[PDB]
Structures are given as C-alpha cells and as structure tokens.
Give the backbone structure.
Amino acid sequence: ERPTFYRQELNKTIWEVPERYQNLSPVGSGAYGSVCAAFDTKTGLRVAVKKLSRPFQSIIHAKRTYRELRLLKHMKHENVIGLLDVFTPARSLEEFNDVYLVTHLMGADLNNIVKCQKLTDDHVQFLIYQILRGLKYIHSADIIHRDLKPSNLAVNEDCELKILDFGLVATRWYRAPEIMLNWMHYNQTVDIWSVGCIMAELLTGRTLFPGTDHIDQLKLILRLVGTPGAELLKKISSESARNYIQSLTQMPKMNFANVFIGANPLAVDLLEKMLVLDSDKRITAAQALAHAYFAQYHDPDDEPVADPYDQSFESRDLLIDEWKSLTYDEVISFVPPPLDQ
Ligand SMILES: O=c1c(Br)c(OCc2ccccc2)ccn1Cc1ccccc1
Ligand SMILES: Fc1ccc(-c2c[nH]nc2-c2ccnc(F)c2)cc1
C-alpha cells in the first residue's frame, strides 16, 4: 500500500518523498540528478536520496533512467552503491514523470579527501583494496564502469568505501589512453587504469596525469608509460592514430621506482601492473586482490562475484513510452533488502 508523501522545494527543485524520510538536506548534483541527505525513520540510518532530472525527456534520458535503475537494483555488494528504496509520487503510469533512488549515506567522496592531503600507505591499501573488491564484483557481471574518478568513490568516517554509479576534477585525468585514442573495443581494464591513477594520487598528493585536453592527456600518459612497443602498434587498426602515435618522439617506459620515490615498493609494483600501456597486459581486479600489497586484507572467500546481469536492453531501440513503462515496472517490482545489524 502507498505511504504518505510530502512536498518541499530545495534549491529550486521540488522534492516529493514519503514521510519515512525526514530532514532532507541538499548535498549536491551530478549531471543526471540532485541528491539530498535524509534521515530514514524506518531504520534510523542516514540515507542519500537522488531525484533523477527529466528522466523521460528523450529516448536517451529514458534509456539512461532505465539503465540506472536496473544497475542499482542489481548491485548487491559491500563496496558498490545499491538500493535501499526506489519510489515515485506517481500513482499511475501516465502520472509517472519522477524517479527517486535511495542508498545508505556514506557522506564524503575521495575528491573531498585527496584535496590538501597526501595519505599514508596503510590507508591507501585499505581504500584501493575496497575499490578492487567492488570492481571484481562489477566486472564479473560483465559491466565496465568507464568513469572511475575520486568523486565516484563514496567514503564514510570509517574509511569504508563504495563505488558510485555517478558522483557529485577533470574526468579525462583518470581515463585510459586507449579511450583518449577513441578505440571502440576497450575492455574492463580501462577501470584498472583509473584505479592506478587514483592510487598514484593518494600516495603522492598530485594528479598523475593532469591533461588540459585529450591530446595533452595522451602525451602525459606516454611520457610515464612509454610510446607503444611493436606488439601494441600492430593492434592499432586506425591509420591516422598510428601515423600520429608513430610520429611522436618515441619514449621509454619510466622506472616507476624512480617516479614514486618514497612509496612502499609493493605499491610501486602494483602501479606498474595497473598502468601497463597495452590493456591486454594490465592486471585484472581479481588478480590485483591477490597481489602482496593487499596481504593484510585479502580473503579469497570474502571477495564475491555478481549474479548474472542482463544488458541486452542496451542494444534495443524503443519508444520513450516503452522505456518509461519498463522503468515503472522496475520501480513497482522493487524488493528492499532486509534489515540486519
Ligand atoms: O555518500 C555519498 C552517496 Br551515498 C551518494 O549517493 C548518490 C546516490 C543516491 C541514491 C542512489 C544512488 C546514488 C552521493 C555522494 N556521496 C558522497 C557525499 C555525500 C554527502 C556530501 C558529500 C559527499
Ligand atoms: F597511443 C596509444 C596506443 C595504443 C593504446 C592502447 C592501449 N591499449 N590498447 C590500445 C589500443 C589497442 C588497439 N587499438 C587501439 F586504437 C588502441 C593506447 C594509446
């Protein structure tokens, strides 16, 4: 049966939510919606409530809305953001024009933490372990995140971490070189690249590759990791890309031990493995969890994999009303997870 809703305006946005959620307080905005912190009276915990902006504005928005709901309904892992609740104030499909999502409030991200801070090795171990543990799960569902950066890593006062969906500086800074090149057959290790860039920054206090644009970004990456060797060169189909790359002044892969000088040598070894230029040679999330850098955290029996995830809708070309109806179906069928201390 339907709960009682109440309406309010927060920052020129209307929020209509069940009375169970109290003390809404805006925390930010992330392209596809706005977020408020709230108090969940049913559990006594603080939650983040996201209101999707214009969910059915176009086929793109409608499919994006469906995609996010499907993804968040599927993610059930300690280090990945999932759903406590999904609701709409709409009492019918024709009424349906707003989607709210709720998750447990972590309360900060790594954008907030990195800033004015170099971290000790022990905290970097724990943070990056958690990221990799979440990534192992995501990758096992044959999902690629594609946009991992500090703002997409939500962290609580205990330094427990969950991977966000979408977060609240430059995104290109964390992006794999093959994506800057525009390769359409990139793999899951694009996310491993991002984690390498994030880990590097946590250890040093500086952006590993602060490119001003995609070209600058590629150039900074190749200065650290070297211009492509022959094995990699042969895998590049594009004539313009290969002409460009091979016309650059050719560069050796740097010794990372020299670059990340003060760092724990196990940290440098993992970084070398994460940031190999040829993506076919980069370490996987599962492999990284078994690396000696994480010896004090790694438990192979507590690093679970995801249930099968149906991404077939991704190929489909549907009407806005069809995406809308499917999303509505997904809201109605939502089963919350159980309360457990
Ligand atoms: O801890 C979170 C969570 Br938790 C978020 O969740 C967004 C969300 C909400 C509902 C569904 C899916 C995602 C977003 C940012 N942050 C970090 C953050 C929270 C409050 C202030 C600053 C940073
Ligand atoms: F300057 C470069 C050259 C190659 C890469 C690269 C890294 N991993 N995979 C690739 C790749 C494979 C096949 N085709 C591509 F276009 C790219 C990245 C930057």
Q: What stands out?
A: The longest strand covers residues 21-29. Strands lie at 5-10, 13-18, 21-29, 33-40, 45-52, 85-87, 100-104, 108-109, 153-155, 161-163. The chain is about 35% helix and 15% strand.
